[PDB]
Amino acid sequence: GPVFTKLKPWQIPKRDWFDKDFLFGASTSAYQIEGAWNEDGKGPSTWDHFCHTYPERISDMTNGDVAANSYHLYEEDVKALKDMGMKVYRFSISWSRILPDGTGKVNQAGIDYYNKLINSLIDNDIVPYVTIWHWDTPQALEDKYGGFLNRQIVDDYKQFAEVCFKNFGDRVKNWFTFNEPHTYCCFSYGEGIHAPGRCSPGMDCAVPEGDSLREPYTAGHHILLAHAEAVQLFKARYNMHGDSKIGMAFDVMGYEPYQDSFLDDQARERSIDYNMGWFLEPVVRGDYPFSMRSLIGDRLPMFTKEEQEKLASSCDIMGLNYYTSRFSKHVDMSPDFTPTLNTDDAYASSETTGSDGNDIGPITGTYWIYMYPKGLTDLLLIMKEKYGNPPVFITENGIADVEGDESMPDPLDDWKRLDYLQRHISAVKDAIDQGADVRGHFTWGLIDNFEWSLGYSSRFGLVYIDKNDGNKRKLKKSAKWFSKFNSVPKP
Amino acid sequence: GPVFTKLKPWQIPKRDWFDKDFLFGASTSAYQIEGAWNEDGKGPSTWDHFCHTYPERISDMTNGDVAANSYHLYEEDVKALKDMGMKVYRFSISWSRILPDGTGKVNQAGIDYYNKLINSLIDNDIVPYVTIWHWDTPQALEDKYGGFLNRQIVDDYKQFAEVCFKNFGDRVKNWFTFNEPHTYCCFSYGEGIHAPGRCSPGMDCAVPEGDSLREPYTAGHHILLAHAEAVQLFKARYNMHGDSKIGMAFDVMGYEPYQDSFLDDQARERSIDYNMGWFLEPVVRGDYPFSMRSLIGDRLPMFTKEEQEKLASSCDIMGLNYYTSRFSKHVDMSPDFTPTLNTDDAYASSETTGSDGNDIGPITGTYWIYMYPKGLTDLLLIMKEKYGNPPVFITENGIADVEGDESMPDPLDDWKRLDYLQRHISAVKDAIDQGADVRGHFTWGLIDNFEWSLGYSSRFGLVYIDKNDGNKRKLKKSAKWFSKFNSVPKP
Amino acid sequence: GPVFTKLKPWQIPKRDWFDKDFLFGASTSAYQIEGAWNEDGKGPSTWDHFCHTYPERISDMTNGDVAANSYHLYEEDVKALKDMGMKVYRFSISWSRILPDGTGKVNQAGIDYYNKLINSLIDNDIVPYVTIWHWDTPQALEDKYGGFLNRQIVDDYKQFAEVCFKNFGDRVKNWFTFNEPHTYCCFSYGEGIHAPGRCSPGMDCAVPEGDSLREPYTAGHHILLAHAEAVQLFKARYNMHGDSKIGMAFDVMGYEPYQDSFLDDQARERSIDYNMGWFLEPVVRGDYPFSMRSLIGDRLPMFTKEEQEKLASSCDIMGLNYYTSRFSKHVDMSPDFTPTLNTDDAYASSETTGSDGNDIGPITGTYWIYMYPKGLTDLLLIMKEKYGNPPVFITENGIADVEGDESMPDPLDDWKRLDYLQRHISAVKDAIDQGADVRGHFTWGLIDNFEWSLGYSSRFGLVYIDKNDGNKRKLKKSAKWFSKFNSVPKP
Amino acid sequence: GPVFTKLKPWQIPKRDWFDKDFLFGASTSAYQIEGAWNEDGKGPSTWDHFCHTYPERISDMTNGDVAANSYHLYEEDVKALKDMGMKVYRFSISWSRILPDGTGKVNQAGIDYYNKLINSLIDNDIVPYVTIWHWDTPQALEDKYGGFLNRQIVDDYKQFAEVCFKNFGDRVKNWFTFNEPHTYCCFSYGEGIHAPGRCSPGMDCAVPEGDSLREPYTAGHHILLAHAEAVQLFKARYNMHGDSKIGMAFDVMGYEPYQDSFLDDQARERSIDYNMGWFLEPVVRGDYPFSMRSLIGDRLPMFTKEEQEKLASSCDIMGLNYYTSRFSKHVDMSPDFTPTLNTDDAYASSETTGSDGNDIGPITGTYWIYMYPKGLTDLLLIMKEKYGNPPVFITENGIADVEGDESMPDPLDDWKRLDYLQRHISAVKDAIDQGADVRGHFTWGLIDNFEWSLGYSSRFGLVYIDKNDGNKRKLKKSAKWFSKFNSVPKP
Structure with missing residues (x-):
């Protein structure tokens, strides 16, 4: 109630299900966990600005000023990874902490911080997978030319990426230029629920003076151009x-077709093309x-x-x-339907x-995460059969425990998250058995963090953050299972 | 609301989907439509007695005294079949109307009635498929020795069947000895909601002085023995x-496994063994x-x-x-579980x-009919692959429109029944394409009738019976579709 | 004669058929090879007692007093493993040699012996896989409370296992709590042909004062409870x-269904449930x-x-x-059949x-080993598809050469054993190709040994034991093939 | 003993398993049933001569002088077919009865006989399928030029066939030019156990002055040329x-490969090429x-x-x-193997x-018929997949009950033949389900007859011939099953 059936004992994944090279890890992003938003020379990001100017746009009236205070407590994050036996830590670098003005003088304090985290990870035999940009744009660039809506963002991003390569490239060997471009374009410029918070006039967002049918595509185009320039530079210098x-x-x-x-089979392909393609x-x-x-x-440029x-x-x-799946329902082209939101352009409603x-799967806590691991296996096979089977890492996967959910009274007893994760790890195994080149699984939420417009009301971590006890890290049931899964020696 | 998605236009069955020998028809049973319960020498049946003695056991306080008055209006039933273009009519013979005392003197008036119906069907190019017994036991035999709970029922049934063969066998060439023995044993002697209404002491039924863990099996054993004796006689004389x-x-x-x-795969096999096996x-x-x-x-004898x-x-x-499907959930054997109802013996709960x-399928009106045509195709393939692929006729299939259901305000606009029937006819086609020897489809409910313990509150007919307009027959939307499906020439 | 067709040259397994982590080895058990039954403080086991009290119950009137004298010649066993290039040696620990009284004072001489064997194996780059109990119960416990028929065996076994973990766990990292519980319960308490030799009154065994329909289940239940307690302790301390x-x-x-x-498909599932489940x-x-x-x-408790x-x-x-397969034939439940032996409870006769x-496969020497490698692949896929695909090791596999068999006049020319082993190694490859997680193959019979009730009349070894030449170890044709298979450098 | 397991009740074929056009029948051949070998102007055939000159070459010293006396009792054969409900009768025409001298004057009495049989069959709604030649060569042609070893047989056969077409073609619409050319060439000119009884010098046959490596091929070549000429004439005039x-x-x-x-897969293809190709x-x-x-x-010409x-x-x-199957075992080409019998040329031994x-299947009575219905389905699929799926009739299929077989003491209780036939009829159904164009099944042995070199010692009939009671026809258990299978009305 809601009925949540768990895997049978003989269906629980074992580390041995994957080869020696497979990598299990956890993920976080700079604005969601760092805090120290204005410390040691760091400049403001679009999210600092968004929260400070339109605080009402965050469900619980919170922000990332302190978050999990990982700027100061990163060693506790490393300890949590070590205690769980994780081999990889995927985190992001704060553009505004490294280049307060977007461009120009590099903030040495910012560089020193990430070097400490990277060196600690390496000293603890954990491989760093770094995301260069995670919606983290310097407000200085937003003010100057509209951030990602202007072509200037391409070279500015390139120079930021170069700073990262030059300073951390000797130890960091795995990078992600951008995180969730589709989510970012849809929510930041379509619905405008995310920083900078823009949408078409008449819509409900912080700054309704944009264009939900155009700005999302303009921003996405610049993201792709910036990615291309950064990669070219990376491979060349x-x-x-190698x-x-x-x-x-x-x-x-x-x-899945509705x-x-x-017709819905065609709609499904349009949905995948729009969401992923x-x-x-x-x-x-x-x-x-x-x-x-x-x-x-x-x-579309x-x-x-x-x-x-x-x-x-x-x-x-x-x-x-990957978090969930939806049914795709065909929408006919006719004068009776006129797109107003960019997502309308797919002519396929997500149900x-x-x-x-019937719901596609059991609700897991937050309103949008319905459990359907089959959807992940299907996507992995599309990567294999249609796009050449490139190396794939599940860079995020998990669920939220929501404040106020009577079915989740003890924040550490996250048996639902554990079952969900076990089921998706098994779905990855299924994909690998079928030939998909999947190289790792990183649970989203090494620790509870700032879930953007929902604030801290949504807890995604394997590790609990006790906000009333100095942001102390406490392993949840799921985290303890990973300790066993990874055969971590006991004290 | 409840969401009821219909087949797409190109998925609607055509008569051409089946070969020239396939037979489409409709079904009814004597007590459910005849009426004239005490007319022209007819003796009382167990259902006449049950309703007259425990009227409160019928949801709407109704009974089969008149029903659709088919004893007098059978020509209108034949007309409805003709108007729809049906090639078969499956009906049952009332034991108490032919042998008022169960055994002894045959009631000529009873014989004359069925001869009229049979001859009318033949004159209208409709083939009669006759069910000899449809829960219709003469109360005289119930009083004398407990009906189907006594071995004497075997020979008495045999002699009744012989009367049917001798009088109607020259024209009727297709027979069914018994109808739904599992339903009958479960409801008449297990839960006791059906005549004679017996169940274990302490349970809620008309006569709680039986044994829900034994009488159902005793009755079923006699049904099988009676069937065996009747068939032996049939084949011999x-x-x-030929x-x-x-x-x-x-x-x-x-x-489907829960x-x-x-474990649930094993439970599913036990469920099928119990329900069908x-x-x-x-x-x-x-x-x-x-x-x-x-x-x-x-x-179990x-x-x-x-x-x-x-x-x-x-x-x-x-x-x-066939009407619906359920999920089968394993039940462990332990001192914590003790069977009290015969259905408990399967150690598999029906969910x-x-x-x-999620529900197994959309609810269609009455509380127990969830739409799941796949279940039928699966059963048909079990008949093919496990039991030798004998000739199979879908002798009943359909849904009820319930009095009081705000989603069904016009009794003739039965688009839900039509969609359900089209989907199951398509499921039969799927089975045939896969090699199953399915020979026909008979919709349960040629006309609305007495739905046992639910009275007339549940309408299963393709043809409406206007109880306030002399039981007039009115074709519903579904019936009209059959007219087109069967290419019936128009006036 | 009997026709024994061998694999074609291009069908012979190569080590390369398996990955670098796969492990090939050989197995033995304490009572079957050690000897020194009463040496250096060792107490008597149920098998010492059984043989000494009912010598007539062993086909050739022999016993394990000396066996292959591995207590003294274990270095020759290690040498044989090394000469064949085996990477694993699966052997068992004698409970009565470590704890002469079942419980109480540990026999240091016993501990020293196994430490020598373990250290020699490690010095020779061979991994020890240890079976804690191999039908080897201390007669002291049999006398005190009936051994495995009493609940006290649970804690006593737990303490024995703990002694093993504490003394050998620093080097031994792979354990098996019990060996063949089904064989043990069936033969020791059902037919009573194995120690302690109990069966129902009227049956032919040493002590016909048991109950073949109950003692086998009581013993098995205690084996499972002892296993559970030992594993809990192991994982905890x-x-x-890790x-x-x-x-x-x-x-x-x-x-295979008869x-x-x-019906025989159902019988087959009951046979597997009984034998393996x-x-x-x-x-x-x-x-x-x-x-x-x-x-x-x-x-069944x-x-x-x-x-x-x-x-x-x-x-x-x-x-x-795994050694062989049988056809499973359905047995109906009726008053005409009454179980007397525990194996009768499966209602499936093994044919x-x-x-x-036709025989299921070629006889290989001893009367019960019919060659049918397909049966092994099938079981491995059941482990994969039904029970979660846990890590599986073929801990025993092989054939016996029987004294008196005119088709096997030269004990070292075991081409039949070699062909049989090659065919089963290939069957394991087939299972792995199909996704089964099989990790190794251990041939039963590193050396010829005491084959329980058949004495030394059945030779199962890859290595011959010359009983008339001081129990000298001589490599057979099969052993020499392994030397080549494992690429052992030559002198 | 020998173990002969029968089909389960739900696996027994029903006529409904096949479509309305499928044809069930029975077969016989002229020399095997007619008798009247020298009556009404009939000339001697090679079999009359063979039996009369080398009587010792027939196991029981019998011959076809009288056989079942069908020349006089053909109406009883028609009655047997009618009583079983067979729709087709495959019989052969005696060349020597129609053309006593092989060529020349047609024997009107011979023509009148077949016309009577044909007209009786038609009057009884039975379709005649006529075999023109069934090893039945006129001895006049054997004497004149060596029968089928001389090219003259081509035109002589053509003229015989024409006589058949002209006289019976108005009613007979289905013909077979030759019966079993492979059997005929192998046994008549290879081993020489059949008329004319020729084989290589040194071999054991009636006339060892032939060439077992050449005469079989010469005869077969002429059979094919005669067939070609007869068909050309048939289609033209x-x-x-049409x-x-x-x-x-x-x-x-x-x-099946041995x-x-x-290598044995290749051997199998050579065996099929030789036997069928x-x-x-x-x-x-x-x-x-x-x-x-x-x-x-x-x-090979x-x-x-x-x-x-x-x-x-x-x-x-x-x-x-079709009667049985064999394993095909590869034979290498080398100076160690030299063909002496034509069958040696396939370089594949039949095992x-x-x-x-293990035997390929259960022995059914006579030494060469091992039951293996799978072999038939396989051949039917080869016809479908390799040779274009032409219309195929199983023109012969059955088993023999042998005189002296203690397991077959009652000649009418042929439950073994019945089970065998049911299994092969089911194998035909399997082929049809898989797309093979199989049009009918004719059981070999409408009646017991002269089984060539084994005389009457082998009974192949569905109908018993009581040789001591005037050759009276008596339906066996198998024949009675066909009556039921074909829904023949009872008296």
């Missing part, structure tokens, strides 16, 4: 030993999915021949951030219930 | 031309399913060598009455919801 | 580094197979909630001792011939 | 209405199988371009005479036992 890898992480939802009909196809073949160009037209060439094959590794009226 | 066929109709529910586990396996191999004997033991021989291969045709909390 | 593994070894026969019929299902889900509980009832929890998932590795009258 | 069909009946054995090896491939593509030409060379053209596609229907030493 920062991979001299042992480094760079790619990007995509937010992806699985999709009804048994060729929007950014994946450009890095694979050098252009957006044909479905998107045919439906968005002039609102064209790539030059040189740009398409730089984009194609620009990812050594693909990161997939939580199918043709029989 | 009433099939001289063109007649006899079998029985089984109520069957489809089953959860992905070998109880009576099907004896007519196929001469004995009850091993699962039942291992779990019921001394409470043993068959003699001669009886097993007479039972094996005793059916020329198999009738399957309407699966491991994810 | 003797796996601090690099050790513990499980049990099951004797298993493959099964005839093409759903009896002990495997409890360690997988915490309870006996449903089929067994439904057929054995009160004669119930597990408490806590016990089921301790049993479920109690094995890190599964050992399968050496199928419906066409 | 005796199928004006409703007649002509082909030939081939004796065929199923084959051992799991590509020898005569089938020429009528399909116009030439012998490549394997035969590569191995037999100059001993070459076809001219015109002959290959006349042979290709010369059969409207294919008759397969009754496989690599495991």
